[PDB]
Amino acid sequence: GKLQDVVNQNAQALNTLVKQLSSNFGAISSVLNDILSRLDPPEAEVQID
Amino acid sequence: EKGIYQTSNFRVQPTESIVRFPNITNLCPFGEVFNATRFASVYAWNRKRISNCVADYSVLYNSASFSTFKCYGVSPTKLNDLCFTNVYADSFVIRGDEVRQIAPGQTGKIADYNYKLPDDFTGCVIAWNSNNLDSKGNYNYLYRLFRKSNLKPFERDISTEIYQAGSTPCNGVEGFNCYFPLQSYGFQPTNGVGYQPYRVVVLSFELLHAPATVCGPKKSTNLVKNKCVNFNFNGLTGTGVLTESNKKFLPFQQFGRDIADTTDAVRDPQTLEILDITPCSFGGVSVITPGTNTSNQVAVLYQDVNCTEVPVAIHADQLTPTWRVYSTGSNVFQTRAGCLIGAEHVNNSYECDIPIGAGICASYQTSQSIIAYTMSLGAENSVAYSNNSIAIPTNFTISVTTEILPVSMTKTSVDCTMYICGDSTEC
Amino acid sequence: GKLQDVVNQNAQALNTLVKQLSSNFGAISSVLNDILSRLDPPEAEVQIDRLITGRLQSLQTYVTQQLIRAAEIRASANLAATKMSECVLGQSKRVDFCGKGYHLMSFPQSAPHGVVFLHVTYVPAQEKNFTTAPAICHDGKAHFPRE
Amino acid sequence: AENSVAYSNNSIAIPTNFTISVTTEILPVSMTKTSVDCTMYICGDSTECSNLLLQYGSFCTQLNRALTGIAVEQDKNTQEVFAQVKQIYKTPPIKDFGGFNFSQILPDPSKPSKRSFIEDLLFNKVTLADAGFIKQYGDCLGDIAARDLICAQKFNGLTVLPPLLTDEMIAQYTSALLAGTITSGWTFGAGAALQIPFAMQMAYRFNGIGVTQNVLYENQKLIANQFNSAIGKIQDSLSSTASALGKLQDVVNQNAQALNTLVKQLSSNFGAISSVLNDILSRLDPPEAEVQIDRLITGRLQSLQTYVTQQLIRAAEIRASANLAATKMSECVLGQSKRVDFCGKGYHLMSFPQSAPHGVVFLHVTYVPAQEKNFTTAPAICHDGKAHFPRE
Amino acid sequence: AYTNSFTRGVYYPDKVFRSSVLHSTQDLFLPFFSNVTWFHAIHDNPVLPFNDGVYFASTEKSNIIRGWIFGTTLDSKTQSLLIVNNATNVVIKVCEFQFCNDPFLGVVYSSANNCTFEYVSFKNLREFVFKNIDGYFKIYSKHTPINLVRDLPQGFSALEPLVDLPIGINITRFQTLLALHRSYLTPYYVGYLQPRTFLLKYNENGTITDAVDCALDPLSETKCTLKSFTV
């Protein structure tokens, strides 16, 4: 079990890092191709920030 | 409690203000570009370069009637203090429903096909309508309506070709799917607000780096020589002591920089003298104390400061007289950690009580004072070694000592949602 | 003092985390019930997000330092388990591991969040000078001592 | 390299000679003690940034507390390794140690330092030349060259605090440990130092590894010459340009890189119009300058927080290393150890400490067997219907 | 036809005093170990493009090469720029000149056609860098004496600026003019600057002593990303 816990703990952390890409953190979306096609770069910059 | 404590800066300090500027010749041509009746139209605008001016901006945003005054990288009240290195002016006249398009990143036919400010614009845009001179139907004003592609920032292009869309070669002769771009304005006093003609002036400058040529209407002051001020050299501002420099510049160089992109020296714009710039708070102070149930005596250590510049370092002449007792006096001791003022130095050696640094300790010891000394490592000794002598023990003791080891700690738990957004649903 | 400093540090960390709930981090107040009784949801959201950002950062700092402190308490408890096996369940030869002297035996006692070891050692005393020799020659043969 | 042991079921190999071997072990003990003025880094000298930093609560108090804990831990780290004994022994003038020559590791009274020859060699192989902030903070010793240099007001709030024990004091501690081990053996670590001649002590230590003590008295000059040659090989290797203090140089490299990154992060703008805080204040009114100054404040706070977290994780590893060095001073220098490969490689005889910059060097003296031969062996011998087994 | 420029063309990018630092900059430089064209007017003067800048160096004996013209159409439609000197003051006209197909000297050629503004102010090596963003016109220079057989030395030479002119002209071609005693009306090294990233080394007195460019080989990237000269 002690050798299994290390592989499990590392795989969870990589899964959580990849799933944090579907968050928008208060922007309008979490896709960079859909922020540029729906705003103008005066204020399409502060969503990407 | 007994120990030594680093203390943040609470000492009060007053400052004064300095302004220096170059000698710039004459008042600025702003009587030209705001009074000129012969304005242009947006499809061909006029760029006028401005240099060597003393321009008073405050008699035009106050002593005038303007509809919208919008500055973009600067503030209007700070314009009198700066120096602008190159100033441009751009003048035309258009309809006041599209004065919202003289702005960064805006869209529309005046913004796509006539005039394109860049997104990092620094300057001001000034507008005020006309109903006398740019009207009567006055037909002196064009604007382009058709273009193959959008314009790039700060570009202008006059080309009176004809614009084709469909499947017809239109070279020189008009026809189907083919148009002429420059179709004009209709400005009449038979209208309301919205189609009326408006004048618009766009100023653009650069605040970054050069010798300064356009400046504001401000007059110089003295140089007060090792005191904290709010200085102002050519528009670059700061706060601190002005030390006399001996650095070796080049003929073109104007100021100095360290690693962190801060300014540590500067050239005076009148007397051509290089003078060093240094901060002023001195938050490198430590305070040695015994307990406050024991005494109210303290000693003060000034970090890596030689003992003669302690009054000049901490600006002792402007502090309270209950602080200035500790800037000099009878008890002054120089260590390799700094200058120790308030504890007297003795010649014995004891075990360490309060560690000061680099071999020095401090203690409360017999009136009761604070003493400073070099710490001792233990008692000197010598073994009686020869090549045929031994020591054997004849008795013994039974010793019982004590060792303490920590094993666990407290198990806490935090509900995130109640800490951050406590009992609320909008959060 | 080693046991009292652990209690003191954990209490100080929890008090700093409670006091950080009165900062506004640039909002108009630190109180979430006063933003949501003076503003309508397009405008209140900009202040609530500043408060959210600051409070997340406070919690994250608390948890990082708790992990770093728990690693140190773990390393101390491993040493206490090695001392329970080697000084109480046996007699150790490692110098200065179970007290100062030559180790005879140890006894454990229980403390709050910790353990106390009472090490019993043999300390020599009251020495005397003699003359010595590495060997002894008797019949043309060298003699050495057994122990 | 491949190898095959000649395993039979009645064959043994016994050594006929030996070798005295002296090897070197380097351990880091402490690191550089820094402190940051949080307000001078973030808002430096501006009294408009200072009132906006008070809206973030007690972050600067919390950062200064963690750095002060690291800097106190560094002095405790040195105290647990070097202050093992509370008596300062001296060594007698006549060095009649039975043929053994401790000249290169005992202190030299000629030089200003209390250092030996080998410690002098060690204090030149660790350099600070390509170490940006720490070397140029150490260059605030211009000695006359500018009358008013307050070198704490020159590096945006970052300083270096001196250690509590100087280098002469650490050299005095190792001098006392060496004199005690040479003149009394293992007795001064358990009580009072009881003197013994040096060849008798070496006879005890040969008994400790399973060799009878007539072997030392019969091969005494050979053993002393082999020791005197291995010490010369150590000294000739360190006086070369083969730089062997790599584990001590890596700590200084990591610390200097971490401080250079923090000085360079003061030129990022993090989304503001400028990274210079005196250009935001001379070009904008306060309700609009507030927006850019909050961006600079947030970015600079994050830079400081990342620095402090990685300093705590580095300090935990220096603490583990110093605990290992203190156990080796107790078990290799103050006694003779039986743990395999804990105090060298071979059967352990004795160890000697030397001070290095932020570290310690151990010289382990071990016994290595050599020149083996083949014999036939038996588990017992039958004489009178009885089985006989050898006593040792 | 073709020769090498070893570490050749390094100029100051600002007017900021730096001492004892290793700065990293990004501007229009002449890249190291490039192929420069070395001209000699034996039989001439062709016309050469102006892509992003021109590193100009020449080998002077008796004041032969004097100045350059910076043209775009050369039919008196679009403006151009003439920068000459006659040992009394350098003179800079921005007129729409009477551009013939070969200039010369009366050992005097100066027309007046709608000028915007005017400016008035193998032994030795005289190198120059001309770069023209539309809005300025920067000229850099350095004087040093060389005593080599034909080519450029391998020493390091920082090129300080002399003047900056607010111009705003597209410059697509340029052409030099050297000393002719003949007077007709008939009907030097050039390298081009590219966007590179350089690592400059300041010492005290504020002097750049050696530079590292990044895009030359892999060891160059090692030296730049380590911010060092030793690996």
Ligand SMILES: *[C@@H]1O[C@H](CO)[C@@H](O[C@@H]2O[C@H](CO)[C@@H](O)[C@H](O)[C@H]2NC(C)=O)[C@H](O)[C@H]1NC(C)=O
């Ligand atoms: C060894 O030390 C012990 C003390 O640790 C000595 O015992 C003491 O002897 C004196 C002399 O008569 C008595 O007054 C004390 O009462 C004794 N102490 C105890 C605890 O019994 C002992 O005599 C010493 N032995 C030798 C041989 O010197």
Ligand SMILES: *[C@@H]1O[C@H](CO)[C@@H](O[C@@H]2O[C@H](CO)[C@@H](O)[C@H](O)[C@H]2NC(C)=O)[C@H](O)[C@H]1NC(C)=O
């Ligand atoms: C054990 O090894 C040592 C070497 O470490 C031998 O000493 C050598 O003896 C030869 C001849 O007697 C000399 O030429 C060498 O110079 C000696 N070496 C040293 C370092 O002194 C010793 O003889 C060996 N013992 C046995 C029994 O063979």
Ligand SMILES: *[C@@H]1O[C@H](CO)[C@@H](O[C@@H]2O[C@H](CO)[C@@H](O)[C@H](O)[C@H]2NC(C)=O)[C@H](O)[C@H]1NC(C)=O
């Ligand atoms: C112990 O070893 C040292 C180091 O080899 C000896 O000191 C050197 O001896 C040589 C030759 O006798 C001299 O030329 C050097 O000047 C000595 N000093 C140095 C290198 O610092 C020393 O003699 C040895 N001790 C004994 C008793 O033999």
Ligand SMILES: *[C@@H]1O[C@H](CO)[C@@H](O[C@@H]2O[C@H](CO)[C@@H](O)[C@H](O)[C@H]2NC(C)=O)[C@H](O)[C@H]1NC(C)=O
């Ligand atoms: C002990 O005896 C064994 C058995 O002969 C030796 O092992 C071999 O010796 C021969 C020559 O005698 C070598 O060619 C072989 O390589 C050895 N190894 C094997 C696996 O056969 C062994 O060398 C003897 N020990 C000593 C010290 O000589």
Ligand SMILES: *[C@@H]1O[C@H](CO)[C@@H](O[C@@H]2O[C@H](CO)[C@@H](O)[C@H](O)[C@H]2NC(C)=O)[C@H](O)[C@H]1NC(C)=O
């Ligand atoms: C600067 O000059 C160049 C060359 O004269 C201009 O590019 C060409 O201009 C002619 C005008 O006669 C066009 O017919 C060409 O099609 C242009 N070449 C292209 C588009 O590749 C250039 O446009 C001028 N720049 C400015 C800003 O006026």
Ligand SMILES: *[C@@H]1O[C@H](CO)[C@@H](O)[C@H](O)[C@H]1NC(C)=O
């Ligand atoms: C020029 O404009 C100013 C306002 O900027 C005004 O005071 C002045 O009377 C105008 N002059 C003329 C001749 O219109």
Ligand SMILES: *[C@@H]1O[C@H](CO)[C@@H](O)[C@H](O)[C@H]1NC(C)=O
């Ligand atoms: C500017 O004028 C002052 C006179 O008050 C003079 O002292 C100074 O030298 C002048 N600076 C120049 C001409 O650069």
Ligand SMILES: *[C@@H]1O[C@H](CO)[C@@H](O)[C@H](O)[C@H]1NC(C)=O
């Ligand atoms: C301070 O308080 C402690 C705690 O009881 C006490 O022991 C000590 O004597 C006090 N100090 C003095 C100077 O009385």
Ligand SMILES: *[C@@H]1O[C@H](CO)[C@@H](O)[C@H](O)[C@H]1NC(C)=O
């Ligand atoms: C402090 O300054 C004085 C005056 O120059 C000087 O004599 C003294 O050496 C300085 N102190 C030290 C430790 O250098």
Ligand SMILES: *[C@@H]1O[C@H](CO)[C@@H](O)[C@H](O)[C@H]1NC(C)=O
């Ligand atoms: C300490 O010693 C020095 C010189 O030995 C002497 O001048 C000084 O007065 C002494 N001070 C004290 C407090 O003993």
Ligand SMILES: *[C@@H]1O[C@H](CO)[C@@H](O)[C@H](O)[C@H]1NC(C)=O
């Ligand atoms: C042993 O002899 C030495 C030499 O005089 C002396 O200093 C020491 O005190 C003696 N030890 C005892 C226990 O008498």
Ligand SMILES: *[C@@H]1O[C@H](CO)[C@@H](O)[C@H](O)[C@H]1NC(C)=O
């Ligand atoms: C430059 O010329 C050399 C010939 O001397 C040729 O080998 C090389 O390919 C050329 N081009 C470069 C270096 O880009």
Ligand SMILES: *[C@@H]1O[C@H](CO)[C@@H](O)[C@H](O)[C@H]1NC(C)=O
């Ligand atoms: C000056 O500019 C005008 C305006 O286009 C032009 O007609 C005239 O030819 C120019 N004069 C020259 C080029 O000499």
Ligand SMILES: *[C@@H]1O[C@H](CO)[C@@H](O)[C@H](O)[C@H]1NC(C)=O
């Ligand atoms: C810097 O200036 C000093 C003083 O003129 C000079 O001695 C030194 O050589 C200069 N440095 C270099 C690298 O030439």
